[PDB]
Amino acid sequence: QPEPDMITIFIGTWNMGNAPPPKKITSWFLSKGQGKTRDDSADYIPHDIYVIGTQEDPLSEKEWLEILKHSLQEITSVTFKTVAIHTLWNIRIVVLAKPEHENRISHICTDNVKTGIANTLGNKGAVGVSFMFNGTSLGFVNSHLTSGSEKKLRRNQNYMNILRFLALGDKKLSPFNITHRFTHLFWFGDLNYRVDLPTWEAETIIQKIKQQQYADLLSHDQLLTERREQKVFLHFEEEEITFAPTYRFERLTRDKYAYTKQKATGMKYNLPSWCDRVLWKSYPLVHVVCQSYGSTSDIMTSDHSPVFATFEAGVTSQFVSKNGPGTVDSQGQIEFLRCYATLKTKSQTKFYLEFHSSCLESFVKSQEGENEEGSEGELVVKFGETLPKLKPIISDPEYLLDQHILISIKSSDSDESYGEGCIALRLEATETQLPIYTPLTHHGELTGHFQGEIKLQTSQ
């Protein structure tokens, strides 16, 4: 039985509005309703992995697991295995996988982050799951961010706290936050970003939604605008939105948006908004294709509609050679030429690099670089031809060209990372000097750039 080189992943996010679901929710898992929907001809084909995020979930873990598993069994005739379930307050993530994947999945991690302080600590935050699927690391974050049209900055702060403090994936990757630890990272939830138009325009907005004319609404979506200004979700992708706003509906119909201020809303307007979202970030030159992104039309227990997204995601096998794992393979090497880091920092310490990759027996520290002044005020750290030669565990190009090197640039004085990035080994050529490039981030904010050349030797 061959190991897969592709799997399909279902991502669901639903704010349940503290109400039990209806008896049938299969349309959610089938990607049926509005937006980019799944072909009918696929309905019996199970996804490999289903990741379900809920917010304002009133059910016990047991109650929801019974509904989920029984739903997927009705659709696919497959009894899914529970990979992980984690709940913080009313925020929950469930990971289910086809039974054939049970012995491909390992290193399962769960964590949560509570956002805010005092007043603002008590119901918002995130839950997450990570695991290895054969040679591929997968991370999943379900977040319920701060509500309210005038709190986009709070939401951006909630995002930064979640990506700093959520402890998933390989702890040996100590300089790297979740935005660098996974081949594929999926971040979804009730992110609570709103359509930022005047309150007086409520009925106009509703009109536009009834005509399926979303362009003038999406141009005011706070998540799109904040992402465009690099305030949040830097280097993440989102599929084009082609479904109606998923909040705020009158319960038990989808015919009505309930936007007017009420005691129950703290006297806040809830203009129709795309609160409920799915974004991803994959390592460079890994296959990832969004095959659905939409909302259901027939699940009306909540003031939110469920959102679905599905993905084709490239995976690799758990590779064994005569040599590595357990030793190096001297027919392989990774060389770096003419490399330099450009940093935004106003500080003056020496810097060194750390290289981390599962293709190495352990991480590698460089010598310190040479600081120079850039012509526009910047710090340029020159490594020239001084970087160590990296010794991969396996030299076979079928393995090595699928790997990635994580780079941290660290202060000699503090050993704190000033920037993190990733380089793909999926090169156009081996034994050839080729340009490489990654942006550098720290706490998910842009802090600089790393560029230079690479020379990769494989056994072929």
Ligand X SMILES: C[C@@H](Oc1ccc(C#N)cc1)C(N)=O
Residues at the interface with ligand X (CB under 6 A): 81, 83, 97, 101-102, 105, 108
Degrees to nearest 5, angle at CA 110 with 108 and 113: 155
Q: Minimum Å distance from CB 97 to ligand X?
A: 4
Give the Cα separation of 260 and 265 in Å (integer): 9
Cα–Cα nearest to 268, from 151, 182, 378:
151
Q: What residues have CB less than 8 Å from 179, skipping those under 6 apart?
A: 163, 185, 235, 281, 441, 444
| Side chain identity at residue 246, one-letter code | T
d(CA 291, CA 10): 10
- Alpha-carbon separation of residue 87 from 61, 72, 96, 186 (angstroms): 8, 21, 15, 17
Q: Which is nearer to ligand X, 81 or 220 (CB)?
A: 81
Closest distance between ligand X and the C-beta of residue 118, in Å? 36
Per-residue three-class SS string for 305-368: CCEEEEEEEECCCCCCCCCCCCCCCCCCEEEEEEEEEEECCCCCCCEEEEEECCCCCCCEEEEE
Closest CA to 115 of 165, 168, 55: 165
Nearer to ligand X, 83 or 88 (CB): 83
237 Cβ neighbours under 8 A, 6+ residues apart: 279, 280, 281, 290
Residues 13 and 421: their CA atoms lie apart, in Å, by: 29
**Closest residue to ligand X using C-beta atoms:** 81
Nearer of residues 102 and 312 to ligand X, judged by Cβ? 102
Q: Rounded to the nearest whole angstrom, what is the least distance from the CB of residue 138 to ligand X in the complex?
A: 12
Between 102 and 361, CB nearer to ligand X: 102
Smaller CB separation from ligand X, 81 or 268: 81
> Considering beta carbons, is residue 6 or 108 the nearer one to ligand X?
108
Q: Smallest distance from the beta carbon of 87 to ligand X, in angstroms?
A: 17
Helix-strand-coil split of the chain, %, nearest 5: 15, 35, 45
Q: How far is the CB of 104 from ligand X (least distance, A)?
A: 8
Q: Which is nearer to ligand X, 64 or 133 (CB)?
A: 133
CB of 258 to ligand X, least distance (A): 40
Of the pair 100, 203, the CB lying nearest ligand X is at 100
Give min distance, CB of 6 to ligand X, in A: 18
Closest separation in Å from C-beta 16 to ligand X:
25
Give CA separation, 268 vs 147, 173, 271, in Å: 10, 43, 9
